Structures are given as structure tokens and as C-alpha cells.
Amino acid sequence: KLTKRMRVIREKVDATKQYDINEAIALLKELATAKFVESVDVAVNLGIDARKSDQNVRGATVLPHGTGQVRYRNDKNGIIHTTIGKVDFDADKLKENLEALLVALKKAKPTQAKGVYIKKVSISTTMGAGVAVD
RNA sequence: UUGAGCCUUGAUGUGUAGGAUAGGUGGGAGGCUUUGAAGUGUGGACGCCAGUCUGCAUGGAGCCGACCUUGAAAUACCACC
């Protein structure tokens, strides 16, 4: 279950703490500490009834340095999440892609949908923790 | 004593693919691993009783998912769950 590596990375930072977005882009480098090149994803929990097709969320936004583009679509449960780029990019380069996807996520709220949009959104890498960001 | 709600988290569901009791989206060719390891074993749990899960030493440092066969994943792993 628990290995020699996930003791460090899952607990080097506190995933239960809501970090700032400006702090998050530098702390994901610790979460992306690996031999290969990972990809950081923003995980947004949306409680829509995705079986009702009128509440579906779908779109894509722009990346300023290619890959290139980023595409997002929800599952059949309602949780919608996608990447923002590679982790070899600079923290200020992942600054640009994170808010552009986030604002377009706020733009695509359905008319009949209700409730609070963001609860515990997390920057999730390929193998790092789901660090709580706001 | 007995209901209801909360958390870092252990497990959780063969028609048919197939080694396998896959519920999905998200990620990439790396994890697991000399931070004590594969397979056995059993207290206990285990089902649609085809067969599996939790703790470890005597054991002793090895095991895996591409593609392909599939309506689709074939947990090595992480994350939302």
C-alpha cells in the first residue's frame, strides 16, 4: 500500500491546506519531482446530473505556447477536469494556462444549474498529490 | 444503551474481453523496488461460492499495464472520486 516514495510526496506538502494560486505554481514542482515529464491537471468537482444531457459542460480554450490546445469535458457523474500543460514549463508559464482554463470553466456554467461552483479544486499532477488550491 | 450527520483514509461491483469480480473521466511511458523483496500460508473477512482481500517471518530483492483479442478501461501509479 504505502511505498517509500509516496510517504514523501503525498506528505511533503499538506494537501488539506487551501494554498494560494500564486503559491501553487512553485509548490507543484515538488509534486512533479520525477524522472520523466508530468502533466498538471486542475480537478473541479461539479455536482451536475450528467445523465440529464441538458446540463452537460463541454469546451476548449487556448494555450499560448502550444503542446497545441487544451480540451475539457465532463464525465457521466459531473466532475469536470483536464490538464493545463506539462510540468517542465516555468511556473509563470503555467500561470497563464491555469486562469485561462479556469475563467472559461466559469464561463461554461449551465443556465439551469445551481449551487456553489468550486469547493475543493485541486492541482493534480501525473503522480503528485491533489494539492488544494484557491 | 439506541437513531442521524462530519474527517486525513482500509476495502468495495465474472454474462461477454481475458491472467483478473473494468465505474468513469484526467495524466504517460514509467512505477513497484536493498526505506527488507516474489510467490506460499493462515486468524479474520470473501461472492453471481468462475474464485479473492487484509498482517509477516522463516522466505529473501523481484513483479509488471502498452500494442493486441474488446461497446471500452486491461491500477505499475497518481488524482477526482
Whether A125 contacts A87, CB under 8 Å? yes
CA pair distance A48, A19, nearest whole angstrom: 26
Does residue A58 lie within 7 Å of nucleic acid chain B, judged by its CB?
no
Other CB atoms within a 10 A radius of the CB of residue A99 amount to 11
**Cα-Cα end-to-end distance for chain A:** 30
CA atoms of A129 and A46, how far apart (whole Å): 20
B76 C1': nearest CA residue: A127
Give me the CA A80–C1' B80 separation in Å, rounded.
9
Q: Which residues contact A47 (CB under 8 A, 6 or more apart)?
A: A78, A115
A9: number of Cβ within 10 Å = 18
Contact yes or no for A43/A122 (Cβ under 8 A): yes
Taking the C-alpha atoms of residue A20 and residue A23, their distance in angstroms, rounded to an integer, is: 5
CB A26 within 8 A of CB A123: no
Resolution (A): 3.1
Task: Please report, as a single letter, which amino acid is at residue A42.
Answer: V
CA of A2 to C1' of B40 (A): 23
Q: Experimental method used, please?
A: cryo-EM
